[PDB]
Design an enzyme around this catalytic site. Structure first.
Site, short mmCIF file in Angstrom:
data_model
loop_
_atom_site.label_atom_id
_atom_site.label_comp_id
_atom_site.label_asym_id
_atom_site.label_seq_id
_atom_site.Cartn_x
_atom_site.Cartn_y
_atom_site.Cartn_z
CD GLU A 1 -2.72 1.53 0.21
OE1 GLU A 1 -3.84 0.55 0.26
OE2 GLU A 1 -2.37 1.96 -0.70
CG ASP B 1 -3.52 -2.79 2.39
OD1 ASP B 1 -3.91 -1.92 1.77
OD2 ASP B 1 -4.75 -3.59 3.24
N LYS C 1 -14.95 -7.81 3.15
CA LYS C 1 -13.82 -7.93 2.77
C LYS C 1 -13.36 -9.35 2.29
O1 LIG Z 1 -5.98 -0.50 -1.37
C1 LIG Z 1 -7.07 -0.40 -1.66
N1 LIG Z 1 -7.52 -0.01 -2.75
C2 LIG Z 1 -6.70 0.31 -3.93
C3 LIG Z 1 -6.12 -1.21 -4.30
S1 LIG Z 1 -7.36 -2.19 -5.02
O2 LIG Z 1 -8.35 -1.55 -6.10
O3 LIG Z 1 -6.73 -3.22 -5.79
C4 LIG Z 1 -8.22 -2.86 -3.57
C5 LIG Z 1 -9.59 -2.85 -3.60
C6 LIG Z 1 -10.36 -3.43 -2.67
C7 LIG Z 1 -9.50 -4.08 -1.69
C8 LIG Z 1 -8.39 -4.29 -1.63
C9 LIG Z 1 -7.66 -3.69 -2.58
C10 LIG Z 1 -8.26 -0.14 -0.43
N2 LIG Z 1 -9.56 0.00 -0.82
C11 LIG Z 1 -10.40 0.00 0.19
C12 LIG Z 1 -11.75 0.52 -0.28
C13 LIG Z 1 -12.93 -0.75 0.01
C14 LIG Z 1 -12.60 -1.25 -1.24
C15 LIG Z 1 -12.60 -0.30 -2.20
N3 LIG Z 1 -12.06 0.78 -1.80
C16 LIG Z 1 -11.74 1.88 -2.10
O4 LIG Z 1 -11.29 2.94 -1.47
C17 LIG Z 1 -11.65 2.18 -3.66
S2 LIG Z 1 -11.16 3.80 -4.19
C18 LIG Z 1 -9.62 4.37 -3.55
C19 LIG Z 1 -8.50 3.04 -3.39
C20 LIG Z 1 -7.47 3.50 -3.31
C21 LIG Z 1 -6.82 4.66 -2.96
C22 LIG Z 1 -7.78 5.58 -3.05
C23 LIG Z 1 -8.95 5.34 -3.59
CL1 LIG Z 1 -10.11 6.77 -3.73
N4 LIG Z 1 -10.18 -0.49 1.36
C24 LIG Z 1 -8.88 -0.94 1.80
O5 LIG Z 1 -8.63 -1.25 2.83
C25 LIG Z 1 -7.76 -0.98 0.85
O6 LIG Z 1 -6.71 -1.34 0.95
MN LIG Z 2 -6.72 -2.07 3.26
MN LIG Z 3 -4.78 -1.45 0.09
#
Ligand SMILES: O=C(NCCS(=O)(=O)c1ccccc1)c1nc([C@@H]2CCCN2C(=O)CSc2ccccc2Cl)[nH]c(=O)c1O
Ligand SMILES: [Mn+2]
Ligand SMILES: [Mn+2]
Length: 180
Positions: A65, A93, A119
């Site tokens: 992350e 992450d 999740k």
């Molecule tokens: O890392 C995450 N998202 C990106 C990688 S991923 O798309 O592969 C993925 C997606 C989902 C889970 C792990 C991985 C991550 N997302 C989230 C939350 C809930 C799930 C979607 N969501 C977002 O916020 C999407 S929008 C966004 C995402 C990242 C930065 C900025 C924005 Cl605005 N909750 C977590 O705990 C988490 O770690």
């Molecule tokens: Mn996360």
């Molecule tokens: Mn993440």
């Protein structure tokens, strides 16, 4: 149109976390000047991920992350070809070199139980370990194996409750809580 919450975020978290959070939001197309509650949440998650990676031994955790999408996927490719661990469907992450598993950190404002379910269906990747933290102080981890020892998790929980207080004394908590 600059909010109180935007200015609270910038003073609450450290400048490297803020900038990484900004990069992440703009990369996915969001504006921290407008999606300010999301701004606050990304910074919190980021800080928790960093404190977590700090709780182990020296070279224990790889930090996925906070990297740009391409480089984050690059290191997991390398981790997978070095360990033979299954390539996850979505970005985790962290990676744990000691227990040999990817970790998904959760930070939730609702019940540990509910978020943990969302999740696990969302990834379905049987392999990656899940660790949820809440702003009220609870945690659930896959197989009740909480990875780190007790004092490190307690430090994270304490900081989460401090963020909650500082928000509430600014009348910003209620809006943040009903945003998730
Ligand atoms: O890392 C995450 N998202 C990106 C990688 S991923 O798309 O592969 C993925 C997606 C989902 C889970 C792990 C991985 C991550 N997302 C989230 C939350 C809930 C799930 C979607 N969501 C977002 O916020 C999407 S929008 C966004 C995402 C990242 C930065 C900025 C924005 Cl605005 N909750 C977590 O705990 C988490 O770690
Ligand atoms: Mn996360
Ligand atoms: Mn993440």
């Amino acid at each position: 149109r600059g909010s109180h919450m935007e200015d609270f975020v910038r003073q609450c978290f450290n400048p490297m976390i803020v900038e990484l959070a900004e990069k992440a939001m703009k990369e996915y197309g969001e504006d921290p000047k407008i999606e300010t509650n999301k701004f606050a949440a990304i910074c919190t998650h980021l800080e928790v991920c960093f404190m977590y990676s700090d709780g182990g031994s020296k070279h224990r955790f790889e930090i996925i992350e906070g990297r740009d999408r391409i480089m984050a996927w690059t290191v997991v490719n390398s981790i997978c070809n070095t360990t033979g661990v299954e390539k996850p469907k979505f970005l985790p992450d962290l990676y744990d070199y000691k227990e040999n598993r990817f970790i998904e950190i959760g930070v939730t404002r609702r019940e540990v139980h509910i978020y943990y379910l969302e999740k696990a269906n969302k990834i379905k990747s049987e392999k990656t370990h899940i660790h949820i933290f809440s702003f009220t102080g609870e945690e659930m981890a896959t197989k009740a194996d909480y990875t780190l020892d007790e004092e490190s998790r307690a430090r994270i929980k304490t900081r989460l409750f401090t963020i909650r207080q500082e928000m509430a004394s600014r009348s910003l908590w209620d809006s943040f809580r009903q945003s998730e």
